[PDB]
Amino acid sequence: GVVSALSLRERIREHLSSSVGLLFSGCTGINDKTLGARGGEVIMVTSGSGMGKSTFVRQQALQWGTAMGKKVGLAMLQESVEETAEDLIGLHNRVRLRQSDSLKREIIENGKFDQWFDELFGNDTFHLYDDRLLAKLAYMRSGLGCDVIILDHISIVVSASGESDERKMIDNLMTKLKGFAKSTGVVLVVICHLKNPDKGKAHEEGRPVSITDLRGSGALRQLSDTIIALERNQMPNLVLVRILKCRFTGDTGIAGYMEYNKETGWLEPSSY
Amino acid sequence: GVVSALSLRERIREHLSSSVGLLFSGCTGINDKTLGARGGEVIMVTSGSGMGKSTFVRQQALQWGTAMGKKVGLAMLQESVEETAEDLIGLHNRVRLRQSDSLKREIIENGKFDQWFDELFGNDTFHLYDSTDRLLAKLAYMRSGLGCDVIILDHISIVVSSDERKMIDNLMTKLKGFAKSTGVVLVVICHLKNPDKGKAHEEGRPVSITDLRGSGALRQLSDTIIALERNQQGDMPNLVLVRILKCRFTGDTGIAGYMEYNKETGWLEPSSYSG
Amino acid sequence: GVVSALSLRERIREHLSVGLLFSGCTGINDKTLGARGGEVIMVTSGSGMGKSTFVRQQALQWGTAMGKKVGLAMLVEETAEDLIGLHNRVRLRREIIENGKFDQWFDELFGNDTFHLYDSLLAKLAYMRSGLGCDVIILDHISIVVDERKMIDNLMTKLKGFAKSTGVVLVVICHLKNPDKGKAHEEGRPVSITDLRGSGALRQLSDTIIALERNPNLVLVRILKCRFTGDTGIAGYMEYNKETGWLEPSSYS
Amino acid sequence: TYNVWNFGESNGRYSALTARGISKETCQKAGYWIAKVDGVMYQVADYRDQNGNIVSQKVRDKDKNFKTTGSHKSDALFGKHLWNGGKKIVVTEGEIDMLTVMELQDCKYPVVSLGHGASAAKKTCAANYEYFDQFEQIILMFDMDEAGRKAVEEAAQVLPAGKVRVAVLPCKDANECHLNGHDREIMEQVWNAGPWIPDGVVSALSLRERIREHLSVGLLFSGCGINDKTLGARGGEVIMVTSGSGMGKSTFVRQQALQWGTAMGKKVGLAMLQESVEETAEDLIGLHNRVRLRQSDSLKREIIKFDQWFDELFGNDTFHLYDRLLAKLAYMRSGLGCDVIILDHISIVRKMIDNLMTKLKGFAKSTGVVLVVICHLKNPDKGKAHEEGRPVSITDLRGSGALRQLSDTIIALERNQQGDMPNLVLVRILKCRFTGDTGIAGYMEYNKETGWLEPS
Amino acid sequence: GVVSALSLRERIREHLSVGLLFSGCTGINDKTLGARGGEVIMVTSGSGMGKSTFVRQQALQWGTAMGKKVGLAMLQESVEETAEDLIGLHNRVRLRQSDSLKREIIENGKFDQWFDELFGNDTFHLYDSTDRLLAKLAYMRSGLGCDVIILDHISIVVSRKMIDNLMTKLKGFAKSTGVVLVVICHLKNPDKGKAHEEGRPVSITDLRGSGALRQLSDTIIALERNQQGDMPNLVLVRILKCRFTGDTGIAGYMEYNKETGWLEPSS
Numbered sequence A: 001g002v003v004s005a006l007s008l009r010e011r012i013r014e015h016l017s018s019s020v021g022l023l024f025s026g027c028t029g030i031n032d033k034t035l036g037a038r039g040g041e042v043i044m045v046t047s048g049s050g051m052g053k054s055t056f057v058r059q060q061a062l063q064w065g066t067a068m069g070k071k072v073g074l075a076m077l078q079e080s081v082e083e084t085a086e087d088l089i090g091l092h093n094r095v096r097l098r099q100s101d102s103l104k105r106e107i108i109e110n111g112k113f114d115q116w117f118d119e120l121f122g123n124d125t126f127h128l129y130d131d132r133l134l135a136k137l138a139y140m141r142s143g144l145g146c147d148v149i150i151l152d153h154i155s156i157v158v159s160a161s162g163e164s165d166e167r168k169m170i171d172n173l174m175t176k177l178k179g180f181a182k183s184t185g186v187v188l189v190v191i192c193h194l195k196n197p198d199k200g201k202a203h204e205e206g207r208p209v210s211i212t213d214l215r216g217s218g219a220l221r222q223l224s225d226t227i228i229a230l231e232r233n234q235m236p237n238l239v240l241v242r243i244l245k246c247r248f249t250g251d252t253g254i255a256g257y258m259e260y261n262k263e264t265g266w267l268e269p270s271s272y
Numbered sequence B: 001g002v003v004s005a006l007s008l009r010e011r012i013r014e015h016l017s018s019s020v021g022l023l024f025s026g027c028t029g030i031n032d033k034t035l036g037a038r039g040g041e042v043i044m045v046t047s048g049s050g051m052g053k054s055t056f057v058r059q060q061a062l063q064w065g066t067a068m069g070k071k072v073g074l075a076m077l078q079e080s081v082e083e084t085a086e087d088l089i090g091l092h093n094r095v096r097l098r099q100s101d102s103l104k105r106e107i108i109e110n111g112k113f114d115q116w117f118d119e120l121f122g123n124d125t126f127h128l129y130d131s132t133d134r135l136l137a138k139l140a141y142m143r144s145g146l147g148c149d150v151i152i153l154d155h156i157s158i159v160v161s162s163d164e165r166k167m168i169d170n171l172m173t174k175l176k177g178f179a180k181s182t183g184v185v186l187v188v189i190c191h192l193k194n195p196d197k198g199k200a201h202e203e204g205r206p207v208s209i210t211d212l213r214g215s216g217a218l219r220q221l222s223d224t225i226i227a228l229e230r231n232q233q234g235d236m237p238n239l240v241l242v243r244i245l246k247c248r249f250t251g252d253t254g255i256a257g258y259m260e261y262n263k264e265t266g267w268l269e270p271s272s273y274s275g
Numbered sequence C: 001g002v003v004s005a006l007s008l009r010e011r012i013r014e015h016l017s018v019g020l021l022f023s024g025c026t027g028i029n030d031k032t033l034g035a036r037g038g039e040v041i042m043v044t045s046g047s048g049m050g051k052s053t054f055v056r057q058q059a060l061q062w063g064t065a066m067g068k069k070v071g072l073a074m075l076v077e078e079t080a081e082d083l084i085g086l087h088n089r090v091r092l093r094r095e096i097i098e099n100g101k102f103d104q105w106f107d108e109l110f111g112n113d114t115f116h117l118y119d120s121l122l123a124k125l126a127y128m129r130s131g132l133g134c135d136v137i138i139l140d141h142i143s144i145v146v147d148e149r150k151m152i153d154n155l156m157t158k159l160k161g162f163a164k165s166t167g168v169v170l171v172v173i174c175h176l177k178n179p180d181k182g183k184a185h186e187e188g189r190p191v192s193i194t195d196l197r198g199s200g201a202l203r204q205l206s207d208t209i210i211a212l213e214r215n216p217n218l219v220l221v222r223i224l225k226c227r228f229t230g231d232t233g234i235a236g237y238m239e240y241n242k243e244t245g246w247l248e249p250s251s252y253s
Numbered sequence D: 001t002y003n004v005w006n007f008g009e010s011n012g013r014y015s016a017l018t019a020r021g022i023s024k025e026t027c028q029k030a031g032y033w034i035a036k037v038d039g040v041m042y043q044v045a046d047y048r049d050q051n052g053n054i055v056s057q058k059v060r061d062k063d064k065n066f067k068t069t070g071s072h073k074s075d076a077l078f079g080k081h082l083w084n085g086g087k088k089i090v091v092t093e094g095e096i097d098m099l100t101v102m103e104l105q106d107c108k109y110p111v112v113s114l115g116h117g118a119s120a121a122k123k124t125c126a127a128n129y130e131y132f133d134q135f136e137q138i139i140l141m142f143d144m145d146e147a148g149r150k151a152v153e154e155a156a157q158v159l160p161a162g163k164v165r166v167a168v169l170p171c172k173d174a175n176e177c178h179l180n181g182h183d184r185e186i187m188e189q190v191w192n193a194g195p196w197i198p199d200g201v202v203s204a205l206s207l208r209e210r211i212r213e214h215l216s217v218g219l220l221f222s223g224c225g226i227n228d229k230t231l232g233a234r235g236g237e238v239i240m241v242t243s244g245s246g247m248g249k250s251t252f253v254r255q256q257a258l259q260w261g262t263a264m265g266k267k268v269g270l271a272m273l274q275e276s277v278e279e280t281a282e283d284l285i286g287l288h289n290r291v292r293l294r295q296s297d298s299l300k301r302e303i304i305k306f307d308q309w310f311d312e313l314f315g316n317d318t319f320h321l322y323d324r325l326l327a328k329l330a331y332m333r334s335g336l337g338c339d340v341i342i343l344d345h346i347s348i349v350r351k352m353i354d355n356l357m358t359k360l361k362g363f364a365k366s367t368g369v370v371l372v373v374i375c376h377l378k379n380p381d382k383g384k385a386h387e388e389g390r391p392v393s394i395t396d397l398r399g400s401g402a403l404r405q406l407s408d409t410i411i412a413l414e415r416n417q418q419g420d421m422p423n424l425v426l427v428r429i430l431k432c433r434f435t436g437d438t439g440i441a442g443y444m445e446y447n448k449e450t451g452w453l454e455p456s
Numbered sequence E: 001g002v003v004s005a006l007s008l009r010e011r012i013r014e015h016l017s018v019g020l021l022f023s024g025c026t027g028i029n030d031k032t033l034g035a036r037g038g039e040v041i042m043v044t045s046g047s048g049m050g051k052s053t054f055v056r057q058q059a060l061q062w063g064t065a066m067g068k069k070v071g072l073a074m075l076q077e078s079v080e081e082t083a084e085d086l087i088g089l090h091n092r093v094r095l096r097q098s099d100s101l102k103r104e105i106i107e108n109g110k111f112d113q114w115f116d117e118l119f120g121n122d123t124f125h126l127y128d129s130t131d132r133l134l135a136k137l138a139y140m141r142s143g144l145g146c147d148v149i150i151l152d153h154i155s156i157v158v159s160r161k162m163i164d165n166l167m168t169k170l171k172g173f174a175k176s177t178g179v180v181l182v183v184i185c186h187l188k189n190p191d192k193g194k195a196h197e198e199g200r201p202v203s204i205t206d207l208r209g210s211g212a213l214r215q216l217s218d219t220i221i222a223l224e225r226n227q228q229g230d231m232p233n234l235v236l237v238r239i240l241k242c243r244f245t246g247d248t249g250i251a252g253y254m255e256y257n258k259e260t261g262w263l264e265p266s267s
């Protein structure tokens, strides 16, 4: 039932003995402000429509799954497992494998595909996926032992189910997912979208995004710990990062600037 | 089921050499920054009211049917079966079959009407539709039971006609799930909403991405977005502009290239207009 | 419902083996080629600026000249008195009840029983089309029939579905919205395609958009949308008669 | 109930019908016979499918009971197996009518019948659309009742169009006209009938004399316009007065009740449920003598000449006040001879409102009395309220929606209550079955000193 | 069950024979005259505008200087986080947001010296996460004798009538037991104009769920600050309703003092 504050010395001693860390990549001001992703938090990544909300998260997954040895689970629902495991092969070798038939035919010919495959998927650090979703996430946490779970494109788990009221279903899914992340203590990266503005320019042409532009409900900004927003204009490759809310620390605002390399596919830091 | 990282050795190897893009016709500036169309691709086509969506999609269907041998299925709800059959037969013979009563009277009295009919539909690639939930079942029967590769849906606002936003979101989700794990190009024709200030879309206004009417869930589940424009009150009423608004595979947006519509043959050809 | 390509061996030949011209201004047939089966013709004008006269003249010229049954859902005896006063070239709006020539005017119009009226919705129109056997159906004042955006879109969807696979010419009269800057519609402002009030689905399901404009009595007919040919602009000029009610075609520059 | 009754196990015998008027040949051709089981003679009719197999029995006794032998299908017609085409069929309501038509036509025309009647005609006529394609004309022969007219009206949607005609009869059905010797008038109704014309489709040929009738009143209304548009009140009409709370429904209907008892001289039966009986009489006394009574303390005790003002307007037996309710209103119609019945509030009286409105409609159809019923409006979900000048639509009817499907005219009032002046009402006619025209009727002012709604 | 007014002298004499002050700005104690027994207090702000920080400072000032029994209910988070936050806030050192200092005091041996300074008594009590919440609050009120009960999040209690029934039940509990009760709720999504995070003045309409959240509570305190502005730490405190005093409006101003963590007043 209730817990007295006097018989709590051992738990407070063992809690701060350990976690903290798990830095980001691509930019410096994100780790300056947000100080990385933590266990139990829910980090929400927002962009426009086709503005680079899936390249950034897969680049972060490639950084976290290789350079730190953390077991990473990916619930990709936009594309199948044949494409989201193909881009990680090309991005590690600094090429664009899916967008060139010549390199595909060359790595079929010379036998370099096995050398690119065993150099990445040697350790069990990537677990993919193709009420029937949260049980699979609980199985990934318990039976498999993942440390970073990426939930992609939340707009097709609240619209693909038949409900008379959408907003209450979004609120119930969000509080159940937050309870799962708080109970198991796993790092969770959730991707959502934005809604239509009323006047002025569009989000795909350089609109300064606010916090109330989250599409679907009003509890997406009330049960999340870090809100990262990506903005660019279509220089058609100068993307900037805005930290809209952080529960842990206080400083919010413009983190920095990044640029997208068109020949390799990375997010390099820029100066401006 | 949850898959692992070691069982993906053979399936990625098979998928790597399975995938082949289908080229576009009419303009060469589109293929330079879209790279065609593959399995699990949704191509949204939009313009103003009466700007030439149906003509462009019908030309694309004809060039994918009579040249590359791809099995094409249509779901024309804007018209019926005989009208679009006459449109295809007239368009392949470089004439306008509906706009000439004398030509319709002539080609039936000289016995050559079987010459035009047996050269297109004799290779039985085309499969038409004779006009929610049963529409998806009929499209699934058209895909699995017949083996088509391109499926065209025209004027989606009939299908969504309580609350339109949840219906069009569930419809777009069902069509994206139907395109996923099946391997079929899905072309969807939609329209635009009313403008707020200034000139209209039928007089030559540049369109944004937030003008697709009905909801905002149309540009969030589409893989390629193509917009056509022309001016019917200016000097050149047959000079169109093609604008790629969103490309999730390549990432190049903007003006592809101008084209010119022929009033006598029904075709529209690649022009050489400069801005 | 799935129909293959080899099943249309003789249905296309049956479909090849239909035009209904417009009276008054002869320029309108020069660019839209009349009408055909499954043709929705949206006719609009200003606030009482030649709004219910042109459609009535086209109904009268289609009824007694080509033998086409014309069903008017005008929104009963008033339109009959107006047609009798219009065909005999008099300004109705006393003598004919005395000398007995009212029966002579009645026996020459409705004696070939083509016309049908509506008593002051879609099942009645389906009975009028299938049971009675008409070809032209006219609806006026669709703002009276119809949140004023979901109803009008479903109404246009049901009317387009009724006109499909039936072979009927459906003429629909609508209104225009109020202007904001410059000059009004009653002074001779050139109309745009986005002036149809109520929704934006009116020009996405119609097959012909005809607009009428006037100020002293010279009217202007403008084609705004044609899905058969694609020619827009001014189709001609007509002049209204203040003594007979018959607006006549002119040759104004 | 048990099994299909064989004639060997039930002593079947084919005989005639003397008391009904059917010989033995018609029942022999159809299959109608009589069994002797359980002592009492049981009459029985046979049903056959399209092939001709025995599929159903209909067992009736001398006391008009029903006994279906098993699974009764919906596509089984009495007289269907014998005919498989033709150019003219005659659809009856019962089974003895089909035998009567076969007797009076010498077994020539293809004549069928229904197996359910006027209660389930829609179920047996909707699923039988594929059988009616091989026919050229259909002649409907229903009863001269209310249920027969309801069946022939609701059977207009499931039958093919342009082929079905409806005939009329002076009897209940064809059998009493067969018994009363009207064998020369039924053949003219079979050969000649009338088209449908359902409720909105008026052909131009049928205006030979209606335009001349247009080129040629009832109980009038007080205050401007209304009687010029709806042509007054008639017998059997159900007048509805709908407005917002505080818009003056009771004052308007009380002024209409006063001018129908002092000028027309008709017996008016009041029924006030919103207030007591000691207040509406004082309000009528104050309304007649041009001086407001219930809103002045000194004049209520100054006149107490009270008996003079009492018997000036209550000197006759004109008005009848009131302090389950349908028996009261039936006594007010019959036992008192009243012409006007006013019901002030209906919500204090889903399934309750519909049954009450059907019962009041049947009462007003049987008696033929002027009936005024007052109800309220809904609550609008967006915009201004009905009290600041929003026009009342026909959709906003408080309770079950069917208050407009069983009425005859609807009068609404609008005035700006919190505005520049509250004493200028707008009268709107929403629906008139006879005249047809709707819209704004006129404008009245209240004249706060007196209480009369004089026109302006 | 009715009680006449004449035989009520003894119950009026024993009833009337200021209250718990707030901390921070001095205007909030001057305007609504502090908290009283039996009240229901609402604290409103935008998303991440300092709801838990202000009420945690209030619990620290009411649990140490006054010595009253304070019962926290952190349904939003765990108990180790709020325990470490209280230990850091009492010692004026930002503890949870510093990595090089959490491992410093665990080896020095002065961690228990900071622990027994505020948890030496049996004062604080914590909740560990539909109808069991009211039974646990009744247990905290009876079996422990708590004076101020703080409820951190009302929206996750909701799995319109379920909010009205819950608020009537909480008002009946706080009226029968006579306990001071603070309940935290959120604001709704606006439709036109700026957001609440960029310095929009909060109206009394903006309350999620239903509209009876402003009808049963006794006082409403809103906090506003400009997040994307010239300074992000100057907050404004707005009193929206007070049944006892009546005066509402802008109370005062507080700055955050980023290094320490105390909402100290400004001018």
Ligand SMILES: Cc1cn([C@H]2C[C@H](O)[C@@H](COP(=O)(O)OP(=O)(O)OP(=O)(O)O)O2)c(=O)[nH]c1=O
Residues within 6 Å of the ligand: A047, A048, A049, A050, A051, A052, A053, A054, A055, A056, A078, A232, A236, A237, A238, A239, A259, A260, B220, B221, B247, B248, B249, B250, B251, B252
């Ligand atoms: C980040 C970025 C991407 N791109 C291009 C390359 C990418 O392949 C393409 C989109 O890749 P994605 O990362 O898949 O785009 P998305 O996730 O935002 O799409 P959606 O919102 O529909 O889910 O955009 C740029 O051109 N400039 C950029 O700065």
Ligand SMILES: Cc1cn([C@H]2C[C@H](O)[C@@H](COP(=O)(O)OP(=O)(O)OP(=O)(O)O)O2)c(=O)[nH]c1=O
Residues within 6 Å of the ligand: B047, B048, B049, B050, B051, B052, B053, B054, B055, B056, B078, B230, B237, B238, B239, B240, B261, B268, C203, C204, C205, C226, C227, C228, C229, C230, C231
């Ligand atoms: C392509 C093109 C067509 N046309 C003409 C010829 C076509 O027969 C006519 C209409 O072509 P459609 O393609 O049928 O018009 P639409 O589909 O855009 O209209 P809706 O929204 O109602 O479905 O337009 C031009 O005038 N200029 C052009 O550039």
Ligand SMILES: Cc1cn([C@H]2C[C@H](O)[C@@H](COP(=O)(O)OP(=O)(O)OP(=O)(O)O)O2)c(=O)[nH]c1=O
Residues within 6 Å of the ligand: D244, D245, D246, D247, D248, D249, D250, D251, D252, D274, D376, D415, D422, D423, D424, D425, D445, D446, D448
């Ligand atoms: C119509 C009208 C009424 N009045 C007065 C007459 C009445 O004394 C008072 C209210 O009118 P009433 O007729 O008494 O209202 P009501 O009882 O019919 O309403 P409901 O049954 O729905 O509750 O207002 C005016 O002063 N000016 C006016 O224009």
Ligand SMILES: Cc1cn([C@H]2C[C@H](O)[C@@H](COP(=O)(O)OP(=O)(O)OP(=O)(O)O)O2)c(=O)[nH]c1=O
Residues within 6 Å of the ligand: A222, A246, A247, A248, A249, A250, A251, E045, E046, E047, E048, E049, E050, E051, E052, E053, E054, E076, E225, E232, E233, E234, E235, E256
């Ligand atoms: C009050 C205040 C807090 N902060 C920062 C520093 C604190 O560590 C951080 C804590 O935020 P919280 O107080 O936990 O935010 P919240 O409770 O209002 O919102 P929610 O629980 O719904 O997410 O806020 C400021 O930067 N400036 C301020 O004025």
Ligand SMILES: [Mg+2]
Residues within 6 Å of the ligand: A053, A054, A078
């Ligand atoms: Mg994506």
Ligand SMILES: [Mg+2]
Residues within 6 Å of the ligand: B053, B054, B078
């Ligand atoms: Mg089209």
Ligand SMILES: [Mg+2]
Residues within 6 Å of the ligand: D249, D250, D274
């Ligand atoms: Mg009243």
Ligand SMILES: [Mg+2]
Residues within 6 Å of the ligand: E051, E052, E076
């Ligand atoms: Mg909080």
